[PDB]
Every structure is written in C-alpha cells, then in structure tokens.
C-alpha cells in the first residue's frame, strides 16, 4: 500500500465539496454514472479496431448495488478501467485544469451541480461519502484499489479480492445522514431524472 498526497487544487476541491452546505447532493449519482458511461464508450470504441480488447468480457453495463447494513452504495461498470498511471498521475493531471477552473466559477456564482462540465464529476461522491474506494481493472494492467477519506491523501495498492475481468467498481461509504441514497425508490428517482439517456443498461440490485 502506497500513500500519495492530492495535488493542492484537488485537495482544495475536496475540502470545498465536503464542508460546503449544499442540499442538492443527489447529483453525485449522475456524475458517477456519467463516468461509467464514458468508460464504456471508450472500451467499445477501441474494440472496433481491436476486438480482442473484449476478451475480458463482452457485456457493457452499469450496476448499482446499495447495501443498507454495510451502508455502502456501489457503482459497477464493465468499461475500460484504469491503469496504475491513471489512478496516480494521468487523470489528476487532466483534472487540475478543470478543478482550478471549477473553483473560479464557484466564485463567479456557478453552483456545485456544474462540476460535471469540468471533467471532475467523480469528486462529487464526497458530497454523500465519508470514504470512497475504487476497484479497477484495465486490460493492460493489474487490478488496483484506490481509496481516500479526503484529508489530502489517498492510497493505491494491488487488489487481491475477487478478479473483475475489466471495469471499475466505485464503493461509497455513505455518511450517517445520507442513507436515503440506499433506498430503491430514491435511486430509481435519481436515475430516471438525471440519467435516462445513458447508452448502456443501468441495473438496480434490490436488497433481499
Ligand atoms: C482516478 C480517480 C480515483 C480519481 C480522479 O481524479 C478521477 C477522475 C477525474 F476527476 F480526474 F476526472 N475521473 N475518475 C474516474 C472515476 C471512475 C471512472 C469509471 N467509472 O470508469 C472513470 N472513467 C474513465 C473514463 C475514460 C478515461 O479515459 C479514463 C477514466 C474516471 C477518477 C477516479
């Protein structure tokens, strides 16, 4: 397990998201599903010139898995997944420009629901989550586990749990006062009003 510091701009963005009073928190799910949809676009597009990239799984879908007892909401896709370089450097590098630009806008008057147009929608997960775990598998790399409870640091480590084949699992350890996002009626309402035009099956896993 390696520990890394966030870039100052990203760390600043996370502090803002965690400690700003913002009631329209449900937008986190639209942003995470948009991330999955982009990941699925990319693997499908690349498979058009190299069909062997789908040997790790041909189905392209998004699963939403709430867990009331663990107080976790998990978003699973079979998209392209992320490499070690993605998790530690490349995505952060791209995010720096959008993050800084996003924090300017937050002072021009723009509100938090706009985070998506800056390419940094993933970090909206910290509106509802005290800790975020990302399990991801790219065709050209091993399975890795990313985790952060904000505070300016994050960890990456090789994962040894069950293999995923290919794709990304985002595990939101929900805050105490945010368990409404574990209710199936609530999840269905958010999906239908923010993400009804996603080009892949979105499946809600009902708890038994
Ligand atoms: C690396 C992170 C842990 C922290 C991060 O900063 C970040 C960001 C960023 F804010 F930079 F935009 N985005 N982001 C993230 C999170 C889930 C996914 C998905 N569900 O696959 C994702 N998709 C691909 C889509 C196609 C791209 O070619 C590569 C990514 C990206 C993360 C996860």
Numbering used by the authors: 17 to 224
How does the study describe this entry?
Heat shock protein 90 (Hsp90), as an evolutionarily conserved chaperone in eukaryotes, plays a vital role in cell differentiation, proliferation, and apoptosis by assisting more than 300 client protein proper folding or conformational maturation. Heat shock protein 90 contains four isoforms (Hsp90α, Hsp90β, Trap1, and Grp94), and in cytosol Hsp90 exists in α-α or β-β homologous dimer form, and every monomer consists of three domains. The N-terminal domain (Hsp90N), with ATP-hydrolase activity, contains an ATP-binding pocket that is responsible for ATP binding and hydrolysis to provide energy for client protein correct folding or conformation maturation, which is indispensable for the chaperone function of Hsp90. Hsp90N inhibitors could bind in the ATP-binding pocket to prevent ATP binding and then disable chaperone function of Hsp90.
